[PDB]
Design a protein around this ligand. Structure first.
Ligand SMILES: [Ca+2]
Ligand SMILES: [Ca+2]
Ligand SMILES: [Ca+2]
Ligand SMILES: [Ca+2]
Ligand SMILES: [Ca+2]
Lengths: 304, 286, 287, 286, 304
């Protein structure tokens, strides 16, 4: 027998008490190449993979529930498929800085774990990694969301086709409970090639021009966004030179003739999840202009 | 007891992937596990309605020269409903293996181990414990003639006589058929995105669970609409390895196909005819 | 007695009358798909709980006819409710299956797998039904046979619920291909589909389809349009055609009434199949 | 054993007593306990002939604002025969409760606990363990929407199939119908003094166990006498909340009502037509 | 220190917890007769008393507070007062069915306890009774409110006046708490005589005609009610034969010439507790009619 109050009190009891930790692990292919005979000249950077939960598929999804993760174990296996008579060599190693962009044989052998071997032999690379707790959501500084990157370079010239596959065996512990939308969980990518407005087409441009191993082997229909604005020279149609400013790209698949592919600029309407295309570039007697400089960061924005 | 245990080893399937064909990802066997597919069990199942799986292993068995230098990944996906052939999907399963094309390997899956039906039905999680997919991981140098073997033991439960056209696994489309992809009388099998359909022999007949609408004309500038529920596979060759499908009428009594009406395209609006996830049972006897 | 009850009863499944000389080897006299509703005392309990599991099944044939009739039958319980093969051999394969003269009652005592089932029907039917009893002829019946089939059952009901009287009746798979050659402008024959549940369904009945019924039509002007209907309604057969006939149209659902909405055009078209083997016809009408 | 135990919780009934209506004594639910009234048990009873009560509790459940300041008394009277709705009668029973309209309470009655029939019969002490009455104790300030719940467990004994029109509780009149209270074609339900009749929906049909005599005329100054056994409820509204009854003919096969002859009053002596204690079963399907 | 609510709660504590059982007993006269010499022919049913709390006066009142009662002990004493030289015989016995209406010596001696004796001897009848729980409120079935009835029949012809008195010694237990109005606690009575509309008067009729031992020795001014309607043939006054329907009677006391008495029909207005009288019966050339058949149940409705 209790009295009738003005207002009863809340009885929302089990709230804010969600599962906290998860150890989780597996083995994931982290890339695959095929090199035809001539290709594979000394030093050709066959692979360059920045490690982030997203790259390890199974992990990537669990990471969308917690805010931190910390690496408990990593190794990579190399496992090219090729017969004994192939006389080319590779060198792999895990770079513990995710920002480091200089890929030389000399800079790998320097890394702990690094391996060197003819194409017909498998190898295991038992690397050195942070074992501290990084973040699952991408951020401004990369040093905080990734423990480093795994690169593999040719060492001689392959006599024949090389079918390399590079597997990462991981185990990791996810630390903090939270809900992170799949847009922010993507890894940022730095270009290593200048984009000139002399090297253009009316509505697209080459992906090899940017000189980035990820953007080269990036998938179709894939909408990106940039930190730096893109300057498109358009016209009213009186011989008039006007200026347009777009922030977003769109990947189109490549060819056997054009290894890397295209990139159509435009507008990524996020409120409605769609992608408009960018205005006709005006070819003109306009001074040479770098529209996007070396080091432009491109972060994937569409639904994954 | 009334229950019957049975065990054996049997070839689940055999593909030949010829020289140079095939590239990382290329699905070289996609087999939905049901007793019909397992030869000796095939006949035992025609007798009862219900089976339950006691043991399952697949032994991969590829045949090529030692210098072949391609590669494959194999594995067993427990969801006969899950339709995702990517390597990443495979590498996520238990049992999964990877090797060079000259190496046999044994995939040791985990599976339902529960009581399932022999004849197909709407929900195919009660007809099958899962499906095995084997993919390419590189480009194969040589002809490889892979023969995947399955060692199996099962428990068969209630006696029955089973219609053999019913025992077969339903195949699902992976790609949409658009109206603008039809030729006058046929279309390319590859459009449907399904390896089991692509490799179904010449003259296989399939019923669809969704209507195939064919716009036609009398030849007066007048567009009319027809409906069809059956397809006939016309075998693929070197020029068109997926082969072709003709729509038409399957007569279930006489067991005969009659080709349907010609497609007439006349300034029609964009249309989806057979959306992805269209189900295609084998109705013709084997 | 909060959640589980055992119920036992026996109950008529179905009655059939064979006119004299009707029926022949393999004539399907009764195809009854089992569901709690079809068995009368049980159907009331299955409305109370939403899960049930079968513990004993037994059917008694009891055909009534003169001692001289001299045709025959064969009956059995076929545990897959999905199984549409109604051949003699396939029936005789069923455990407990019996074959006898039209003037001999028999009892079929089968085995069933005794799974937990649902009371309210859903998409997969092997979760709502333990199977279907079939009875078919094995010679020509000389006399009229008025066959009643009984079912003795004991069952375990499990999860307390209260179901609505509309969802409980199990849908029907069509057995035969409906060609457009067979159409008449107002209606079509029931025997063409070949489903004995359809062939027997009482008139004023309404059945929704899972596949679209594509009706050709024209207001006039020598002009062929194309129309769509999801429903069917049963119009009773007469001694000349016992099958009955089906008339398409519109089943207004708020209405609680049928509207024929049937227009057809008979013309030189290429032969088509409108409703193929396997079409699922759910009973939607008022109850 | 052949006996079946069954237990549940179910709403016995739900009244809305609107703002200001209702005064100390006003009967707001009067429900004779039989399995039909208890929803889930309703169906179980249609199967057997006999039930016996194992447990019974009512939980009262009134819904209004906290400031409602009326009141009610509830209880369970063990005599389905006893026809006395007074507070004093209620306060005499075991279980009886009193509260403000915003307070739920639980009445814990004492009941027969013996073996009873499912279908109605002459002596209704064998069809029911009693009846629950809930009354007003003050004037209610606000609209209250009271929903009285019953938690019950029972034992059902012999299997049977039961006619659902037979399962229903007979209603007894509380007030006499006098001849001088008839209108030309109808009379006011309130005259009969029965809450269950007063709240029976529009179009309910009732059979009487006593004849309703209607004096009529041909229009010649000649008085004649007719007899009727059926009433039809015509729904009550704000102006006449009890509604009205028309006498007539119920056709039991076609399940249709035909209104009877007009009443003609012509210097007739005072008469009792339907004495108090006239029994009125629901014959129309529900 | 408690806060002020919107509404305090009910404090109606001791409710619904009334006294439950009562054993209670006594000895009550259940009837009395006086038989003048000639009367008392073999088999004359001198007494016929249906046992119900009401008949036992003290008990009758307690019974209005509980719903059930169950009999714990019964005996009857017979105790005629008469001198040794009276040469007649009686036979008593308790019929355990309250509905049984055939009173023969042969049907008593059959009953357990039954006694037979010359008028000048007392007797005790130790009967057989239900000992189950009946109901205090009358109902449709009598088998449920009464354990049976005590009848006493003459056995020879009394030479002299016979003053018999028949006492019932009882003990009973009252089971269920409730409040039962004195109108429903009365016992129903079945007639054993047809009422013809040829055997009538303008406003009343004989009580012996009904042929019921209770209704015969029923008291004055005593308003009854029937299950079956009564058909009174009245007139508008043009020689017109109209039809009237009354449900209620009224007892008027009897005579030395008319042992049983009268019964005036009418209207028992219960809302106001009064009794109107019924219309002038129209004597007419009307076909012979049974107005109330054998077995009509008459239940007392006025205040007791
Ligand atoms: Ca985060
Ligand atoms: Ca089967
Ligand atoms: Ca359900
Ligand atoms: Ca009954
Ligand atoms: Ca009582």
């Amino acid at each position: 027998r209790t009295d009738a109050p003005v207002s009863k009190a809340s009885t929302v009891t089990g709230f804010g008490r969600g599962t906290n930790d998860v150890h989780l692990s597996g083995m994931s292919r982290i890339s695959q190449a095929v090199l035809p005979a001539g290709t594979g000249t000394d030093g050709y950077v066959v692979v360059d993979a920045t490690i982030v939960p997203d790259l390890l598929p199974r992990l990537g999804h669990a990471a969308r529930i917690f805010q931190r993760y910390a690496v408990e174990t990593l190794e990579f296996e190399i496992q090219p498929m090729c017969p004994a008579n192939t006389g080319g060599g590779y060198v792999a190693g895990f770079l513990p800085d995710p920002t480091d962009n200089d890929h030389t044989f000399d800079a790998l052998q320097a890394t702990r774990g690094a391996v060197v071997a003819k194409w017909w032999e498998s190898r295991t690379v038992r690397p050195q990694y942070t074992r501290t707790l990084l973040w699952t959501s991408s951020g401004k500084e990369q040093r905080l969301t990734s423990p480093g990157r795994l690169i593999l370079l040719c060492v001689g010239n392959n006599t024949d086709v090389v079918n390399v596959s590079v597997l990462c065996r991981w185990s990791v512990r996810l630390s903090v409970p939270s809900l992170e939308n799949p847009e922010e969980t993507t890894a940022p990518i730095m270009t290593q090639g200048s984009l000139y407005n002399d090297s253009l087409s009316t509505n697209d441009f080459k992906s090899i021009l940017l000189g980035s191993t990820p953007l080269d082997i990036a998938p179709d229909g894939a909408v990106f966004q940039l930190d730096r604005p893109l300057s498109i020279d358009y016209s009213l149609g009186t011989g008039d030179v006007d200026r347009a400013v777009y922030w977003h790209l769109k990947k189109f698949a490549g060819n056997a003739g054009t290894p890397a592919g295209w990139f159509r600029w435009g507008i990524w309407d996020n409120f409605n999840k769609t992608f408009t295309d960018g205005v006709a570039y005006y070819s003109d007697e306009q001074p040479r202009q770098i529209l996007l400089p070396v080091g432009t960061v491109c972060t994937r924005v569409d639904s994954e």
